[PDB]
Amino acid sequence: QNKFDIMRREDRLSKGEQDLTERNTIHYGVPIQQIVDEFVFRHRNARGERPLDYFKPFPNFRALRLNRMYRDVEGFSLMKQRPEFLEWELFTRYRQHHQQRRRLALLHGLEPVANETAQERDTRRHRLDEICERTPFDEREMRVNDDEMRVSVETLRSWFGVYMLPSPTVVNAVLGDTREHVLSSRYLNRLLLLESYVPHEQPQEVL
Amino acid sequence: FNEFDAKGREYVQYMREFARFDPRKSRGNGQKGFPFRDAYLTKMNEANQKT
Amino acid sequence: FPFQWKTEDWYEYEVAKVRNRRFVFENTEEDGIRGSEVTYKIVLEGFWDHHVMKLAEDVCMFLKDVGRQIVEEKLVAVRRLLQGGAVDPELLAAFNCARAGPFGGLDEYDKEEVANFLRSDLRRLEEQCLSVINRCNVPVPGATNIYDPHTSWPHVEKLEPWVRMAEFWTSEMSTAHYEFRKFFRVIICKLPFQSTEFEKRMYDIRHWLHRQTSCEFHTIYRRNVIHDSAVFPTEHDPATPTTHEHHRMFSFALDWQSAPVNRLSTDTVHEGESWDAVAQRLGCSVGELKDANAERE
Amino acid sequence: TLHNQRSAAPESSVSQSHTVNAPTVDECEMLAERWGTMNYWHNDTFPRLVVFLKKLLVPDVSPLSPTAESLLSMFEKVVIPKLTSDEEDRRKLVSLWSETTLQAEAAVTKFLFQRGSFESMLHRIITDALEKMSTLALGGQEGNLALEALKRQTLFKRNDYIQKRLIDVVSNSAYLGYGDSVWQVFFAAVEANEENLLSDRATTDAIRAAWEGVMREDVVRLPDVTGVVALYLTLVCIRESGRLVPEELKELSSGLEDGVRPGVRKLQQYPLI
Amino acid sequence: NGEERAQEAYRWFDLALTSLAVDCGHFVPYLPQGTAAASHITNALMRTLLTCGYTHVAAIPDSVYDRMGSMGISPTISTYELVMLALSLQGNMVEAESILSFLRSHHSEHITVESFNALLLGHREARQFDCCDAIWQELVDRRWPRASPLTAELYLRSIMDHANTPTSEPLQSFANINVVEKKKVPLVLAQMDELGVPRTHLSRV
Amino acid sequence: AYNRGNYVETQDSIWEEQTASGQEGWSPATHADGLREGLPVRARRPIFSSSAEQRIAGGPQRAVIIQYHHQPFFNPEPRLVKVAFQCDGTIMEVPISDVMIWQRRYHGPERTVGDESRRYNPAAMRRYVDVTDPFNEKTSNTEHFLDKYEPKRNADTVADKYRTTKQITEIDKWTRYDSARADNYRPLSISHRRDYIRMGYIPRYTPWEWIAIQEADQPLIAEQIRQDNIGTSYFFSLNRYWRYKA
Amino acid sequence: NMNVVQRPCIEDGLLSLVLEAVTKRHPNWVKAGVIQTTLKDPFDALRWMMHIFIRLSYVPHAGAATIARLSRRRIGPIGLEPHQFNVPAELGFVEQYDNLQYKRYDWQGWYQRMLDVHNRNVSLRCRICDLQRLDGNGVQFVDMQT
Amino acid sequence: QTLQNNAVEAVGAGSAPWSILGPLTAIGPTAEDTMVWLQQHYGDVDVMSIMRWARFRKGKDLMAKDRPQYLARAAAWIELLSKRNREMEEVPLTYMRKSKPLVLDTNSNVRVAWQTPLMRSGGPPRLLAREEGYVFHHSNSSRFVEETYRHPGESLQSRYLALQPLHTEVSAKEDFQRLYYQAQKHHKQQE
Amino acid sequence: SANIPRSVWDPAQHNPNWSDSYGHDITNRRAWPARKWTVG
């Protein structure tokens, strides 16, 4: 009824925001838990979406939920829709490498902060790469899960190459003996460096 | 199996309570500040016990 | 070890442990699950033990989602109070109220020190509001233990059922033994602030309870009490002391007045009295007498 | 089919009361009146007491040359029979040089924690010296350069004093135990000297009553404090820890609280390799 | 006559700045922009432009604030409160909460109740009533600046606007759901009896 | 802005994005968060004074968790965590409330460990698990010295390995008890979307709409607010009018 | 020998300078008689540390009551006169309303009155350690003999 | 005195240009001019009724006996009840600058601040701030910055990297009174 | 605060570790064979 509200609605629609007159009624539309329960009820406990640990006698609460793709696969460049027989074990080894990197950063005060300037971020990342290249990779924390097999580091080094899973001699040779230390971001950056090298126009019928 | 049975879990908890008992920390706890009758009254009789 | 004691210490231990059963201070200024500001106990009663157990899963899930929403509403206010604020002049006047401080004389707190005492208390609100929120996000239906205070908020505590048996004839032929019984689960809600929004939401659980299942509410809250040293003064003993004859049967109604004793706050000035002579007769300072009588010069 | 209401993430359970973030430039501005905890001034990353002591430094001052050292060392008796030759001008110049040296020492010891007031007072001293120099010194304009050298030297002296005796003392926060071992040393020093601090002959009954009422609560939490008061507490605890530590560890030790408690189970006691 | 009174306010602002440049004839290149009179006249201009139509209300934090910055005039607390009220009438809540967060970070001893009234009115206009409850609970918690009867007016009107709001997720299967928020009204009134806000200082509607 | 080909740079940028948004970071630790050996932690350093009655808390320093007796009989109230601090290596026993872990999410029961992605199968209807060996007990990863004398027959080893191994389709059946299953959560309103198959569904949690209707129908008692700011009437309140008297 | 730090030696003049800066930062400490400027006794600097800690840690009863009324919403009156002490105390009481049979009918009044008068108990609790604070006159409220 | 204290505290003690020209005009030398000045500078309240109410204090006539006490009481009551006096006695605040998100998104709290040409001299004349994308953005952990990038040379880094965000931290506010005071100090203490 | 909390309906406040109502009771009614060994 007001000209103020009409001008505000036209301004908000020009900005590309939600009209306040569409907020006149409250919609508590479709919670995720009801959607998941309807999906499970429609698909008869949703087999195929459950992991293989769900069909084991003592599942954890993480095995009781359906399969989703989390933010672990977002960095892996070799990850496809269908991996070829050994890429998932390399991805799990890289994931455990980053988890040990997170543990080492929490140990030595190299965790990120909220107001981090990019120069402080690069300094903290360089110090974390300096302190993680001299720490050996812990294999006791490497936990095998739903379907993958237990693969040693030597099989992955023979198949994928020595550059994919490096030795300290290898990272000293690329940035400048078979043992595994925690991966660093500057070494993978050097590896990627070496691998890369009229308004209101009208149609013809109205014309 | 587990480590202890039902009465064994009870009396191992009473020894952990008396190992960290401090009477000034029993300020307003009520009867939960009473420090395991068996081991507490044993200490009060050391003038008679004399190992 | 082995435990051998005097019997007089064991006689004194066993009476002291039962008499001090409810001599407990619930709302203490402390860390997590022990310490709080208000304590709510909702005693649920029903005729079957699985009826009260299924209700205590229905109410604890209700008070978890409600209580997390209210504490998040208090946590979003406490984190604004910690970013910055202006000191209340009535709060500053409360610190500078005593005549003599701990260091002798008037302790003049500025706006820096009073905002420091307010910041150190609001830092305790954040550590206690995060303790309730973290225990409200733990009980997933995959792994749920609502009977442990370290795991869930609120937790359920067991109570002994009320059981009363009857001995009556089935005829002088035989005696029947039937027992009335009802079962109890109590729900302990410990909040580190007083919220009337939560007390309103707690009282309306009685309108959607289960069949033949009722409840009662317990509330232990902190409340400031003033001991007025002028209404209840600390005086000497009288010259003629009281005896046992003032404490006979029916001396509670005919010998003693109710506390407190009325003391006269008005007086009349005599013939040769001055400002220093009335204050001597009333036992007060001369400047204190003129402040109560600022109308008359 | 979605919701028209405002979608918002749940409020963060990360404790912002104990989260010490990166220091902003407005925080370094208002650090002179900032109330912080002992963890805040002696933080493991970004300690704020070092930032508070580093904003007292006079910037862009440098140690002067050994030529300027040889100039400023001998001005009382070799250059003073060159600017003038008569008795009263020599007497005036001797008195002015001695008074300017005395007030430069007073300036470098007086305003140690106020940089702007020290700078303004030193500028006023240098101008009031230069004007009375320009009255009777003339001699080819030599004394004004020797007073600019003294202006450089006195500005270097305070910046070296607050570096060596304040910044390099409170530098290693891990040696100080991130402020908590400072409080441990303070409580142990009170634990050693109850007869001198809290007695019937030491303090009044109100002080003892307030001290007992502080230390009888459910959790005794340490108060947040101002940066100059934090520096005071740190320096007195550094001085007082020498008496509580046994004689083998008085000079060289690992940590401020090292040997203060009688029996401590350390993690570095087993791995000698 | 929103646009005409806005043009007259801009013309009188230009007249005022010319007379302030006359009346100030060291700090010579920084006059009269550094004086209290320029900030007072700019606050008067913002307070008058709030009265006008939506274009000038939207131009208060857009054009007027940028012009006050480019002229070099130091603002006061009424400047930020009128900018917050203009953003409140626009419906932009993240910028108004950003301005109050700026005031909480830097100049916290100068904040008056008009900023809280601006946020209450704006979250009432943006129909985010949970933020209205959060702001009212924060104002009851800190107790300073003191709650005017305009605070109780805006909060109770936000409660009555939320309680009369129909919902569409149960599709009115049994009854109206939001009426239970009127149960918050006997609580908050009691809070007014603790806040010293007289309930007779409420409008008749 | 980050290198998508780099894995560590991408995961570090994800970590910094979730740290800036407040999702990850130092939060007070629950008992359910998985406090185990080798855990980095921020624990408040306890201060010891003989004049202190209960205890003195201090600033949160970084430490490792050496051990944590999660059993309620090995660790009564208040619970203790054995930690070793970063600065001096001092092993102490701190309370569990003075313990802060680096959470990775808001809603977690175990906020310490991160989420892990599961493998994908296109035709996931066929997947074979040994019923006798669900976690593969009887297989030996290491080569023993006695396998030279074990029988080298092949068919008898594959026969039992394919006999008791069952597909996941015939492990469990969707009965009529699953159709009438009650929700583990409290629903918003009772949904008639799936009401053709359920046939006897009774909820174990009353929905939010029904709670709101039961709350909106009954009034409040004005004396439940129990506000008090004056004090107690020491002279009059017990001597009031006779109909309303104490 | 590499992971050891030489203990720095602090002279009394540097302590006097930092104490002068502390007094100039907080003049109301010297005005209220908390700290001094002098360093005559050898235990003076530790005494001023103890006084600073007592001032920054001890909360008076009226100020603590006002802070508890502010954010924790503790109800009750607050006395600012020196003859009024603030006692933080707990109050326990029972609320009971029937909802099964005695929810409503002509019996509901006397049954609700029976439930109310049966729940007439009010438990008022106070720690004696909370009573051992300083009064408005500077003397402690409850001492040992009290 | 209040305006002089505001201009002193705006810098931190010298005076600011805040107290050069305040909102009060001079009083005319007439009692009618006095009534004019009180009606045009405190006209939201009834000044004469306030001065009549402030006359007596606990029965004592202050206007006939304690004259400066009555003047201080009436001035305090007029300054309290008047809203225009409350709006004209405000402390000068710093200027809150707008900000935009970063081009290379490193943090959600790190933002590129909008800088006044008074702060940085030179450069091109700019447009309005909202068109480029500058809004009011501030929180508890907000940090403001100027964002450039390190200049790429003809080397191994050509396209694989996102041209790393070299940052330079700026302030969140523009203290105009302190800038004017420091500029006048550089115009005065240098000479 | 609101009558129905934000954790119910808002997808940004959804618990990621929450599991459906049907899987746990189907897991709990599984019958596993006891005899895994040859002798005992």
Coordinates of C-alpha atoms in Angstrom, one line a residue, chain D residues 3-252:
Chain D
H3 CA 12.3 -22.2 2.8
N4 CA 11.9 -18.5 2.4
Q5 CA 13.4 -17.7 5.8
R6 CA 16.9 -16.5 6.5
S7 CA 19.4 -19.4 6.3
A8 CA 22.2 -19.0 8.8
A9 CA 25.0 -21.3 9.9
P10 CA 24.9 -22.2 13.6
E11 CA 27.0 -20.1 16.0
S12 CA 30.6 -21.1 16.3
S13 CA 31.7 -23.1 19.3
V14 CA 35.2 -21.9 18.9
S15 CA 36.0 -20.0 22.1
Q16 CA 36.7 -16.5 21.1
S17 CA 37.5 -15.5 24.7
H18 CA 40.7 -17.6 24.6
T19 CA 41.3 -17.3 20.8
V20 CA 44.2 -14.9 20.3
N21 CA 44.1 -13.8 16.7
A22 CA 46.6 -11.7 14.7
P23 CA 47.2 -8.2 16.0
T24 CA 45.5 -5.5 13.9
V25 CA 46.9 -2.0 13.5
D26 CA 44.0 -0.5 15.5
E27 CA 44.9 -3.0 18.3
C28 CA 48.5 -1.8 18.2
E29 CA 47.1 1.8 18.4
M30 CA 44.9 1.1 21.4
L31 CA 47.4 -1.2 23.1
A32 CA 48.4 1.6 25.5
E33 CA 45.0 1.2 27.3
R34 CA 44.3 -2.4 26.5
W35 CA 43.3 -4.9 29.3
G36 CA 44.6 -8.4 28.5
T37 CA 45.2 -11.7 30.3
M38 CA 48.7 -12.9 31.1
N39 CA 48.4 -15.3 28.2
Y40 CA 47.5 -12.3 26.0
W41 CA 50.8 -10.4 26.7
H42 CA 53.0 -13.5 26.7
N43 CA 51.4 -15.4 23.8
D44 CA 53.2 -18.2 22.1
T45 CA 52.4 -16.7 18.7
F46 CA 51.9 -12.9 18.4
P47 CA 52.9 -11.8 21.9
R48 CA 51.4 -8.3 22.7
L49 CA 53.9 -7.2 25.4
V50 CA 56.7 -7.2 22.8
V51 CA 54.5 -5.1 20.6
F52 CA 53.7 -2.8 23.5
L53 CA 57.5 -2.4 24.2
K54 CA 58.3 -2.0 20.5
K55 CA 56.0 1.0 20.1
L56 CA 58.1 2.8 22.6
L57 CA 61.1 2.7 20.2
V58 CA 62.2 5.9 18.4
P59 CA 62.2 4.9 14.8
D60 CA 65.0 5.6 12.2
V61 CA 67.6 6.4 14.8
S62 CA 71.0 4.7 14.4
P63 CA 74.3 4.4 16.3
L64 CA 76.5 7.3 15.3
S65 CA 79.9 6.9 13.7
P66 CA 83.2 6.5 15.5
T67 CA 84.1 9.9 14.1
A68 CA 81.0 11.2 15.9
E69 CA 82.2 9.2 18.9
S70 CA 85.6 10.9 18.9
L71 CA 83.7 14.2 18.4
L72 CA 81.3 13.8 21.3
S73 CA 83.9 12.3 23.7
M74 CA 86.3 15.3 23.7
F75 CA 84.2 18.5 23.7
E76 CA 84.8 19.7 27.2
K77 CA 88.5 20.6 27.0
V78 CA 89.8 20.4 23.4
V79 CA 87.1 22.1 21.4
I80 CA 86.1 24.6 24.0
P81 CA 89.3 26.7 23.6
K82 CA 88.5 27.0 19.9
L83 CA 85.0 28.5 19.7
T84 CA 86.1 31.3 22.1
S85 CA 89.1 32.6 23.9
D86 CA 87.8 34.8 26.8
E87 CA 87.0 33.7 30.3
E88 CA 83.3 34.5 30.6
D89 CA 82.3 32.8 27.2
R90 CA 84.3 29.7 28.2
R91 CA 82.6 29.6 31.6
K92 CA 79.2 30.0 30.0
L93 CA 80.0 27.2 27.5
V94 CA 81.2 24.9 30.3
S95 CA 78.1 25.5 32.4
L96 CA 75.8 25.1 29.3
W97 CA 77.6 21.8 28.3
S98 CA 77.4 20.4 31.8
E99 CA 73.7 21.4 32.2
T100 CA 72.8 20.0 28.8
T101 CA 74.5 16.7 29.6
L102 CA 72.8 16.5 33.0
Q103 CA 69.4 17.2 31.5
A104 CA 70.0 14.8 28.6
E105 CA 70.6 12.1 31.3
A106 CA 67.5 13.2 33.1
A107 CA 65.5 13.0 29.8
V108 CA 66.8 9.5 28.9
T109 CA 65.9 8.2 32.4
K110 CA 62.7 10.2 33.0
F111 CA 60.1 9.5 30.2
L112 CA 60.8 5.8 29.4
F113 CA 57.2 4.7 28.7
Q114 CA 56.0 7.9 27.0
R115 CA 57.6 8.3 23.6
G116 CA 55.8 11.5 22.4
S117 CA 56.4 13.4 25.6
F118 CA 60.1 12.4 25.6
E119 CA 60.4 13.5 22.0
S120 CA 58.8 16.8 22.7
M121 CA 60.9 17.4 25.8
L122 CA 64.1 16.5 24.0
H123 CA 63.2 18.8 21.2
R124 CA 62.6 21.6 23.6
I125 CA 65.9 20.9 25.4
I126 CA 67.8 20.9 22.1
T127 CA 66.2 24.2 20.9
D128 CA 66.8 25.9 24.2
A129 CA 70.4 24.7 24.0
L130 CA 70.8 25.8 20.4
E131 CA 69.4 29.3 21.0
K132 CA 71.7 30.0 23.9
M133 CA 74.5 28.5 21.8
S134 CA 73.6 31.0 19.0
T135 CA 73.9 33.9 21.6
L136 CA 77.6 33.4 22.3
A137 CA 79.5 30.6 20.7
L138 CA 79.9 31.6 17.1
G139 CA 83.4 30.3 16.2
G140 CA 82.6 29.0 12.7
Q141 CA 79.4 27.1 13.6
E142 CA 80.8 24.0 15.2
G143 CA 78.8 23.6 18.4
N144 CA 75.4 23.2 16.6
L145 CA 76.7 20.1 14.8
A146 CA 78.0 18.8 18.2
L147 CA 74.5 19.3 19.6
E148 CA 72.9 17.5 16.7
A149 CA 75.3 14.7 17.5
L150 CA 74.1 14.8 21.1
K151 CA 70.5 14.8 19.9
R152 CA 71.3 11.6 17.9
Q153 CA 73.2 10.0 20.8
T154 CA 70.5 10.7 23.4
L155 CA 67.8 9.3 21.0
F156 CA 69.9 6.2 20.5
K157 CA 70.4 5.8 24.3
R158 CA 66.7 5.4 25.2
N159 CA 66.1 3.1 22.2
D160 CA 69.0 1.0 23.4
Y161 CA 67.9 1.0 27.0
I162 CA 64.4 -0.1 26.3
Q163 CA 65.8 -2.7 23.9
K164 CA 68.4 -4.3 26.2
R165 CA 66.7 -4.1 29.6
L166 CA 63.1 -4.4 28.6
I167 CA 62.7 -6.2 25.2
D168 CA 65.5 -8.7 25.5
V169 CA 64.4 -9.5 29.1
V170 CA 60.8 -10.2 28.1
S171 CA 61.5 -11.8 24.8
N172 CA 61.2 -15.6 25.1
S173 CA 57.6 -16.3 26.0
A174 CA 58.4 -20.0 26.3
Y175 CA 61.0 -19.2 28.9
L176 CA 58.3 -17.3 30.8
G177 CA 55.9 -20.2 30.4
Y178 CA 53.5 -18.0 28.4
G179 CA 52.7 -16.0 31.5
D180 CA 51.3 -18.8 33.7
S181 CA 54.6 -19.7 35.2
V182 CA 54.9 -16.0 36.1
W183 CA 51.8 -16.5 38.2
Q184 CA 53.3 -19.8 39.5
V185 CA 56.5 -18.0 40.6
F186 CA 54.3 -15.2 42.2
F187 CA 52.3 -17.7 44.2
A188 CA 55.4 -19.6 45.2
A189 CA 57.0 -16.3 46.4
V190 CA 53.9 -15.6 48.5
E191 CA 54.2 -19.3 49.7
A192 CA 57.8 -18.5 50.9
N193 CA 57.0 -15.2 52.6
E194 CA 53.8 -15.3 54.5
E195 CA 55.6 -13.9 57.6
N196 CA 56.5 -10.8 55.7
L197 CA 53.4 -10.3 53.6
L198 CA 50.3 -11.8 55.3
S199 CA 50.6 -11.7 59.1
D200 CA 49.4 -9.7 62.1
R201 CA 52.5 -7.5 61.9
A202 CA 52.6 -7.2 58.1
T203 CA 49.2 -6.1 56.8
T204 CA 45.9 -5.1 58.2
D205 CA 42.9 -7.5 58.8
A206 CA 41.1 -6.2 55.8
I207 CA 43.9 -7.1 53.4
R208 CA 44.2 -10.6 55.0
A209 CA 40.4 -11.0 54.8
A210 CA 40.3 -10.0 51.1
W211 CA 43.2 -12.3 50.3
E212 CA 41.5 -15.2 52.0
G213 CA 38.2 -14.4 50.3
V214 CA 40.0 -14.4 46.9
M215 CA 41.8 -17.7 47.5
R216 CA 38.7 -19.6 48.9
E217 CA 36.4 -19.5 45.9
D218 CA 35.6 -22.5 43.8
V219 CA 38.0 -21.7 40.9
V220 CA 40.6 -19.0 41.5
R221 CA 41.0 -17.4 38.1
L222 CA 43.8 -15.0 37.3
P223 CA 42.7 -11.4 36.3
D224 CA 43.3 -9.7 33.0
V225 CA 45.7 -6.8 33.3
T226 CA 47.2 -3.7 31.6
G227 CA 50.4 -4.0 29.7
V228 CA 52.6 -1.8 31.9
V229 CA 51.2 -3.7 35.0
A230 CA 51.9 -6.9 33.2
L231 CA 55.5 -5.8 32.6
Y232 CA 55.8 -4.9 36.3
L233 CA 54.5 -8.3 37.4
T234 CA 56.9 -10.1 34.9
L235 CA 59.9 -8.1 36.0
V236 CA 59.3 -8.6 39.8
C237 CA 58.7 -12.3 39.2
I238 CA 61.9 -12.6 37.2
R239 CA 63.7 -10.9 40.2
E240 CA 61.9 -13.1 42.8
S241 CA 62.5 -16.4 41.0
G242 CA 66.2 -16.3 41.8
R243 CA 65.6 -16.9 45.5
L244 CA 63.1 -19.7 45.1
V245 CA 65.3 -21.7 42.7
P246 CA 68.2 -23.9 44.2
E247 CA 71.7 -22.8 43.8
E248 CA 72.7 -25.1 41.0
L249 CA 70.0 -23.7 38.7
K250 CA 70.1 -20.0 39.7
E251 CA 72.1 -18.7 36.7
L252 CA 71.3 -21.1 33.9

